[PDB]
Amino acid sequence: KETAAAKFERQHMDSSTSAASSSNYCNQMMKSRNLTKDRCKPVNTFVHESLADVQAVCSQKNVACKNGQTNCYQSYSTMSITDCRETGSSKYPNCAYKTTQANKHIIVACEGNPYVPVHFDASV
Template sequence: MAQERFCILFPPLVLVLLVLGCVQPSLAKESQAEKFLRQHMDPDTSTVTPDYCKQMMKRRNMTVGYCKPKNTFIHEPLPDVQVVCFEGTVRCEKGKLNCHKSTSKMRITYCHLKKGSKYPNCDYETQQLQKSIVVACECRQYETVHFDGFV
């Protein structure tokens, strides 16, 4: 009887523990997945102006205290980016093995700090591209947590 009850309750318990492992323990701190969304996702953009990077880097808090040297914004729906976690595994720039490369090209904007630009006047070059992206995924590939590059 006790063994039957254990067999019934054990699978849901394991599932709950796996889900809790993906949840950020501190509500005040931005999770890696939330940071990815803030720093890299801009799916509703149909047009990108020459000032896009300067405006977005400031709006998304990437020029607070210093000028982030480079950043990439992805202009695709979030589900299209999340599905990359189930595509080809590749080695990340820093050697980890949780990166995945998209099989299709995506609309992105690459922002890089203009030469001579210094904090607090962060000025960026804006470059629109169509490239395959490489992202890192965690929690059994349910969350996109890092933009690793484009190819």
């Protein structure tokens, strides 16, 4: 079975590309990471940094999570990311997404031993 840490990697890690993300990126990636299986997942962010760099965020700036929990951490440096946002004309099973590349600080929730990211909270 898939751990929460593995699910975070599946949903949010894309170290293989720098940012290059074509206009096609989200359409392809949302499908290939299985985020369009039961529905069109409305919003999702991929991080283009090393797993080590993202894991390191769990010992960086402690900040409040959007849900009010206290286990969120904001990266000290900006990171290359791609936001995927479902288009208005997207209809399941043919999920369509607008691909937006950016460089922003990420905020992730961390849990467990070892203490690793389990949720992507926000980018600022």
